Design a protein around this ligand. Structure first.
Ligand SMILES: O=c1ccn([C@@H]2O[C@H](COP(=O)(O)OP(=O)(O)O)[C@@H](O)[C@H]2O)c(=O)[nH]1
Ligand SMILES: C[C@H](O)[C@H](O)C1=Nc2c(nc(N)[nH]c2=O)NC1
Ligand SMILES: C[C@H](O)[C@H](O)C1=Nc2c(nc(N)[nH]c2=O)NC1
Lengths: 354, 353
């Protein structure tokens, strides 16, 4: 029997701006996974948002500040004109139009509201543990609503004390949108929000030492940090490609011999890793966080000692030995929408009948 | 036509502690105003709250930081282990046991939560405008739920641009606990924190120029400040008579010929003037804020130019122009539990469905 789902997006910025990071890819991909199984999905998101094909409703208001820019004792914050508050008021108004509401925001409010809704609310947690108030809000929702919380990786789950009670769903891509490129140019790629946690400094330095140009795609979400990188490395240290659509990303990224992933934080998953593999691009990453669950050492990439420049330079030197077709094959075997649709249904359907 | 109400207290501290502020007096007095009319009132409050005579359930967690400590653009905040959040989760769980829920907290969350409740929620807003996020939340609940918001003073109300749509329910005391003293001693009273920047020097200086000792009730935190006062004004100018518990306050304050109210504008809202009037003590207050609405000029007291010693002294010299019995009469007509009960029923009963 087909069901009706409402997906409520992240409040940090509009879908398509890049402010929401990987959520802006994950949400529509999970929506596609369900619509391909016959369900109806609608989306609620901040004003300015764009989404192909699906019903979308947008709500004006002030964006949430990013959780990772605050320390562990920070209170939850609700700004004047908050888009997050507005989104949840609207969800509540329309709750009887859906069988289940799926929250994508790493915020206290929607977790707190869950028992205030009649319709069931489930939560996909995008990041590892960041704050006491969030840890507690997730715990409480789990205590009352077992099975209602999903995560992307076991490494992510292990950052929380209750991580074994979270379901790991991994992630998936719309594989039809990615072209396999068997013949790369002698250049490296890096893809991400241009934000301190992503460690772009490390990748610039490693590419310069390896002697290879670095092409950078990503949203300029932190203009102060971007100017600091310019101050340190100069304006000609990276070739900046802008923030681009999935179709432009996959064409550009496919041309690279490898994707460097150099996060300062513990990455929960890292959509860009699976996007690279989908284009036949091997991934060099630190052996920390989600990439440990994505890459196969010496087959689809390199997992190197965290935070060591020499290891990254060495890995760059061993890209030519990896089979790009193998990377692509791994993407097809593991990261399909069809398989995600199965995992979503196994997660969400039992929450409808209790 | 009796109903069952749930009162949810302020999250700034327990009831009985002093941190609850004016809510310490207001919530029990409004509850009595309703229980004396045959309704049932239960209370939810933070851990450590004490409230004789009413069903009371307490909730653990971190106190909310005071709204006045934050600037106008600051977001609403919910701390880890928030007592405010826990209060409202617990109210929601038990909402079907009540006809109406009355919020006393000057906080974003309860206003926002109002449409998530099936049971009606009303809000008694205790302060004037302090932030954008609180102002907008009150506006929204007014637009969606006309008549659902009350204030204590017509002024506080005017600090908001939608003030005209708030109901003023005024203020109440348990007048049966205050004795009328028709014959005072030749002394003046002052009630407040006994701390710098509270206007105490202004009052001592005026009483002294007028030739009367000053008796004070309140909290002392800095004994060095007390010594400073004694050294400046002489040890006969001012004396400490107690703290502010109702029985000690009513016994002591009624002996005064007048109460001097010399607060800074921030703390210029209301309560102690009605305690004075309830004892038959006329009030001499700076002519700003809450006292403008409470005192009837030249009848129950004198409203004077702020920060001017000559205006206090002139007023003190005209305390014999004022009828103590009339001060008490005004208290019984405006500030009784009976009169508050009437205003509360007028406010809250139309909101029942
Ligand atoms: O030019 C770009 C650069 C990045 N991205 C997207 O940015 C997201 C970054 O997500 P990831 O999970 O790698 O990191 P997060 O930002 O969530 O920490 C990925 O989904 C990319 O597809 C994009 O659409 N266009
Ligand atoms: C990085 C992750 O994909 C996502 O960009 C984020 N979501 C959120 C965030 N911060 C808040 N407060 N809420 C979110 O939904 N920071 C980052
Ligand atoms: C003045 C009022 O009676 C009461 O003392 C206050 N309540 C509150 C406050 N601040 C917050 N956040 N919430 C309250 O309920 N400050 C003062």
């Amino acid at each position: 029997t087909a069901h009706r789902f409402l997906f409520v997006s992240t409040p940090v910025g509009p879908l398509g701006s890049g402010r929401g990071g990987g959520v802006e890819l994950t949400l529509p991909n999970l929506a596609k996974a369900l619509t391909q199984r016959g369900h109806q999905v609608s989306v609620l998101a901040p004003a300015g948002s764009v989404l192909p094909d699906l019903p979308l409703e947008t709500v004006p208001g002030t964006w949430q500040s990013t959780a990772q820019s605050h320390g562990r004792a920070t209170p939850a914050e609700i700004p004047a004109e908050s888009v997050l508050a507005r989104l949840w008021d609207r969800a509540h108004q329309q709750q009887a139009d859906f069988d289940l509401i799926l929250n994508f925001a790493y915020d206290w409010l929607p977790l707190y509201l869950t028992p205030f809704f009649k319709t069931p609310v489930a939560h996909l947690i995008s990041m590892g543990s960041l704050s006491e108030v969030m840890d507690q809000a997730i715990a409480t929702s789990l205590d009352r609503y077992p099975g209602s919380i999903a995560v992307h990786s076991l490494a992510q789950a292990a950052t929380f004390p209750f991580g074994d009670r979270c379901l790991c769903i991994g992630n998936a891509l719309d594989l039809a949108a990615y072209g396999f490129n068997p013949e790369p140019e002698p250049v490296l790629g890096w893809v991400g929000r241009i934000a301190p946690e992503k460690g772009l400094e490390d990748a610039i330095q490693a590419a310069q030492q390896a002697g290879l140009p670095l092409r950078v795609w990503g949203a300029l979400t932190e203009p102060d940090y971007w100017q600091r990188l310019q101050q340190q490395f100069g304006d000609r240290a990276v070739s900046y490609q802008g923030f681009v659509s999935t179709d432009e990303l996959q064409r550009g990224l496919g041309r690279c011999q490898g994707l460097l992933m150099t996060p300062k934080w513990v990455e929960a998953f890292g959509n860009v890793a699976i996007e690279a593999l989908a284009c036949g691009l091997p991934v060099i990453a630190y052996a920390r966080g989600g990439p440990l669950e994505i890459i196969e050492q010496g087959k689809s990439g390199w997992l190197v000692e965290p935070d060591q420049q020499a290891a990254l330079v060495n890995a760059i030197g061993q890209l030519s030995s990896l089979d790009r077709a193998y990377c692509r094959a791994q993407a097809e075997a593991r990261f399909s929408l069809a398989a995600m649709g199965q995992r979503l249904e196994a997660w969400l359907l039992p929450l409808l009948s209790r």
